[PDB]
């Protein structure tokens, strides 16, 4: 799934779907 991990919400295999939640919803 895209959306990079929280700490790294700006990674290559994803976007910033975890800017304020390491386990919230997708974004």
Swiss-Prot record:
Changing residue 23 to A: Low increase in binding affinity to cockroach neuronal membranes and in toxicity to blowfly larvae. Changing residue 15 to A: No change in binding affinity to cockroach neuronal membranes and in toxicity to blowfly larvae. Keywords: Disulfide bond, Ion channel impairing toxin, Nematocyst, Neurotoxin, Secreted, Toxin, Voltage-gated sodium channel impairing toxin. GO terms for molecular function: sodium channel inhibitor activity; toxin activity. It comes from Anemonia sulcata. Changing residue 13 to A: Loss of binding affinity to cockroach neuronal membranes and of toxicity to blowfly larvae. Disulfide bonds join 3-17, 4-11, 6-22. Changing residue 19 to A: Low decrease in binding affinity to cockroach neuronal membranes and in toxicity to blowfly larvae. Belongs to the sea anemone short toxin (type III) family. GO terms for cellular component: extracellular region; nematocyst. InterPro entries: Neurotoxin_3_Actiniidae (IPR016330), Neurotoxin_3_Anemonia (IPR012509), Neurotoxin_3_sf (IPR036247). It is found in: Secreted; Nematocyst. Changing residue 7 to A: Loss of binding affinity to cockroach neuronal membranes and of toxicity to blowfly larvae. It comes from the Eukaryota. Specific arthropod (crab and insect) toxin that inhibits inactivation of voltage-gated sodium channels. It competes well with the site-3 toxin LqhalphaIT (from the scorpion L.quinquestriatus (AC P17728)) on binding to cockroach neuronal membranes (Ki=21.4 nM), and inhibits the inactivation of D.melanogaster channel (DmNav1), but not that of mammalian Navs expressed in Xenopus oocytes. Its activity is synergically enhanced by ligands of receptor site-4 (Bj-xtrIT (AC P56637)). Changing residue 25 to A: Low increase in binding affinity to cockroach neuronal membranes and in toxicity to blowfly larvae. This is Delta-actitoxin-Avd2a. Negative results: is inactive on mammals, when tested by subcutaneous injection into mice at a high dose (up to 5940 nmol/kg of mouse). Does not inhibit rNav1.2/SCN2A, rNav1.4/SCN4A, hNav1.5/SCN5A and rNav1.6/SCN8A. Changing residue 8 to A: Loss of binding affinity to cockroach neuronal membranes and of toxicity to blowfly larvae. Changing residue 12 to A: Loss of binding affinity to cockroach neuronal membranes and of toxicity to blowfly larvae.
């Amino acid at each position: 799934r895209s959306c990079c991990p929280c700490y790294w919400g700006g990674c290559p295999w994803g976007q910033n779907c975890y800017p304020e939640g390491c386990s919230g919803p997708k974004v």
